[PDB]
Coordinates of C-alpha atoms and ligand atoms in Angstrom, one line a residue:
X1 CA -5.8 18.2 6.0
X2 CA -4.9 19.4 2.6
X3 CA -3.8 16.5 0.4
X4 CA -1.6 18.6 -2.0
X5 CA 0.3 20.2 1.0
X6 CA 0.6 16.7 2.4
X7 CA 2.1 15.4 -0.8
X8 CA 4.8 18.1 -0.5
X9 CA 5.7 17.2 3.0
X10 CA 5.9 13.5 2.0
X11 CA 8.3 14.3 -0.8
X12 CA 10.5 16.5 1.3
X13 CA 10.5 14.5 4.6
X14 CA 9.5 10.9 4.0
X15 CA 10.2 9.8 0.3
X16 CA 13.9 9.5 1.0
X17 CA 13.1 6.4 3.0
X18 CA 9.6 5.3 2.0
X19 CA 7.5 4.4 -0.9
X20 CA 3.7 4.6 -0.8
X21 CA 2.5 3.0 -4.1
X22 CA 1.1 -0.5 -4.2
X23 CA 3.9 -2.9 -4.8
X24 CA 6.5 -0.1 -4.2
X25 CA 9.8 -1.3 -3.0
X26 CA 11.0 -1.3 0.6
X27 CA 13.8 1.2 0.9
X28 CA 15.5 2.2 4.1
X29 CA 12.0 2.1 5.6
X30 CA 9.0 -0.1 4.6
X31 CA 6.7 0.5 1.8
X32 CA 3.6 2.1 3.5
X33 CA 0.8 1.0 1.1
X34 CA -2.0 -0.5 3.3
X35 CA -0.8 0.9 6.6
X36 CA -4.2 2.4 7.6
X37 CA -6.1 -0.1 9.9
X38 CA -3.0 -2.2 10.3
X39 CA -1.0 -3.1 13.4
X40 CA 2.6 -1.9 13.7
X41 CA 5.2 -3.9 11.9
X42 CA 3.1 -5.6 9.2
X43 CA 4.5 -4.3 5.8
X44 CA 5.0 -7.7 4.1
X45 CA 8.6 -8.6 3.8
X46 CA 10.1 -5.7 5.7
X47 CA 12.5 -6.4 8.6
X48 CA 11.4 -4.3 11.6
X49 CA 13.0 -3.7 14.9
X50 CA 11.5 -5.6 17.8
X51 CA 10.4 -2.2 19.2
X52 CA 8.3 -1.5 16.2
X53 CA 7.1 -5.0 15.7
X54 CA 5.9 -5.1 19.3
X55 CA 4.5 -1.7 19.8
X56 CA 1.0 -3.3 19.3
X57 CA -1.1 -0.3 18.1
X58 CA -3.2 0.0 15.1
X59 CA -2.2 2.8 12.6
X60 CA -4.7 5.4 11.8
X61 CA -5.2 9.2 11.9
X62 CA -4.9 9.5 15.8
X63 CA -1.9 7.2 16.3
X64 CA 0.0 8.7 13.2
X65 CA -0.7 12.2 14.7
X66 CA 1.1 11.1 17.9
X67 CA 3.9 9.1 16.3
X68 CA 4.8 11.8 13.7
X69 CA 5.2 14.4 16.4
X70 CA 8.1 12.4 17.9
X71 CA 8.7 8.9 16.6
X72 CA 11.3 7.9 19.1
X73 CA 9.2 8.9 22.0
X74 CA 6.2 6.9 20.7
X75 CA 8.4 3.8 19.7
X76 CA 11.5 3.9 21.9
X77 CA 14.1 1.8 20.1
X78 CA 12.9 2.4 16.6
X79 CA 15.5 2.6 13.8
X80 CA 13.6 5.3 11.9
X81 CA 15.6 8.5 11.9
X82 CA 13.2 11.3 12.1
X83 CA 12.9 14.1 14.7
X84 CA 9.3 14.8 14.3
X85 CA 6.8 17.4 13.0
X86 CA 5.8 19.9 15.6
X87 CA 3.1 21.7 13.8
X88 CA -0.3 20.1 14.1
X89 CA -1.6 21.3 10.7
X90 CA 1.4 19.9 8.8
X91 CA 0.9 16.6 10.5
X92 CA -2.8 16.7 9.5
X93 CA -1.9 17.6 5.9
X94 CA 0.7 14.8 5.7
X95 CA -1.8 12.2 7.2
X96 CA -4.5 13.2 4.7
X97 CA -2.1 12.6 1.8
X98 CA -1.0 9.3 3.2
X99 CA -4.6 8.1 3.8
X100 CA -5.1 8.7 0.1
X101 CA -1.8 7.5 -1.4
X102 CA -1.4 4.3 0.7
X103 CA -5.0 3.1 -0.3
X104 CA -4.9 4.0 -4.0
Ligands
HEC201 C1 8.0 11.2 7.1 C2 7.4 12.1 8.0 C3 7.9 9.8 7.4 C4 6.8 9.1 7.6 C5 5.3 9.4 7.4 C6 7.2 7.8 8.1 N1 8.5 7.8 8.2 FE1 9.6 6.1 8.5 N2 10.6 4.5 8.9 C7 12.0 4.3 8.6 C8 12.4 2.9 9.1 C9 13.8 2.4 9.0 C10 11.3 2.4 9.7 C11 11.3 1.0 10.4 C12 11.4 1.3 11.9 C13 11.7 0.1 12.8 O1 11.6 -1.1 12.3 O2 12.1 0.4 14.0 C14 10.2 3.3 9.6 C15 8.9 3.0 10.0 C16 7.9 3.9 9.8 C17 6.5 3.6 10.1 C18 6.0 2.3 10.9 C19 5.5 1.4 9.8 C20 4.9 0.1 10.3 O3 4.5 -0.8 9.5 O4 4.7 0.0 11.6 C21 5.7 4.6 9.7 C22 4.2 4.9 9.8 C23 6.6 5.6 9.0 N3 7.9 5.1 9.1 C24 6.2 6.8 8.4 C25 12.8 5.2 8.0 C26 12.5 6.5 7.8 C27 13.5 7.5 7.3 C28 14.9 7.3 7.1 C29 15.9 8.2 7.3 C30 12.8 8.7 7.3 C31 13.2 10.1 6.9 C32 11.4 8.4 7.7 N4 11.3 7.1 7.9 C33 10.4 9.3 7.6 C34 9.0 8.9 7.7

C-alpha cells in the first residue's frame, strides 16, 4: 500500500480513538505502537474486553486485512466502534502506514 494514503485514512478513521507513536497515550482505544507481531490484547496498560484479550491471533498484515474489513465479525464482543473498510486497496494503504508508524 501507499503510506501517505494510509496516513490520511488513519487520521480520518482511527486517530479519534488511537495513537500510534511510541509512548502515546491510550485514548478510547489502545495505543497501537508495537502491534505488529503481537498477540491480541497486549498494549501495556490498556483494559481490553475479554473478547479481544482472548481472540488469540497474532497481528500482522493478513489478520489486520481481515479485522479491518469488519471488526465485530472478527472479534465478536469487541468494544471498538468501527463498521469496517470495504475496499481492499484502502485497507492495504492503511496497513502499510501502520506498519511504519507503529514501529518508528
Ligand atoms: C481505524 C480503521 C482503526 C484502526 C486501525 C483500529 N481501530 Fe480500534 N479500538 C478501539 C477500542 C475501544 C479498542 C479495544 C477493543 C476491545 O478491548 O474490545 C480497539 C482495538 C483495536 C485493535 C486491537 C488492538 C490489540 O492490542 O489487540 C486494533 C488493531 C485497532 N483497534 C485498530 C476503539 C476504536 C475507535 C473508537 C470509536 C475507532 C474509531 C477505532 N478504534 C478505529 C480503529
